[PDB]
Amino acid sequence: MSHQDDYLSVEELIEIQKEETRDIIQALLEDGSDPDALYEIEHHLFAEDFDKLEKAAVEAFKMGFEVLEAEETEDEDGNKLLCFDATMQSALDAKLIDEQVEKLVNLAEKFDIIYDGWGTYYEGLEHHHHHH
């Protein structure tokens, strides 16, 4: 039973990502990152209709998002779903990153997909194994 499965309030998701994102930006910054280093935002979006997918994926890429081809994905509930990715070059800012999530979210619910996966790469790697 447990009818705990009713996600219908973007207002909430927007709030969360708001705080979380900020927390991340704080760490990335404290690390010494720079706002002029330009960061590539990444967003994961999946759908259940092969057509509806290329549909929402086309609009997104139409605005200005580097849509990425999808590939058989598995969400402990599909075992075989399509998941494409979107990228966008932009400075490192919580307000901006929060915006990209607001547009991708409103657009996602506007079509019929579920947006839930945002990450930001971190350019500037020092050294790994060998000499710790």
Q: How far is CA 5 from CA 2, 27, 47, 112, in A?
A: 8, 32, 18, 17
Residue-range domain boundaries for the chain: 1-132
Looking up tokens 């290329």 gives 54
Q: How far is CA 17 from CA 10, 54, 91, 110, in A?
A: 11, 26, 17, 19
Helices (H), the chain: 10-31, 50-63, 94-111
Shortest CA distance to 104 belongs to which of 58, 60, 52?
A: 60
Sequence-separated (6 or more) residues with CB below 8 Å from residue 78: 48
Q: Which helix (H) or strand (E) holds 116?
A: strand 114-120
Rg (CA), the chain: 17
Helices (H), 5-93: 10-31, 50-63
Task: Please check whether the domain covering 1-132 is classified as CATH 3.30.70.970.
Answer: yes
- Distance CA(61)–CA(38), nearest Å, equals 20
Sign of CA dihedral 55, 44, 110, 52: positive
Looking up tokens 């969400």 gives 75
- Distance CA(15)–CA(17), nearest Å, equals 6
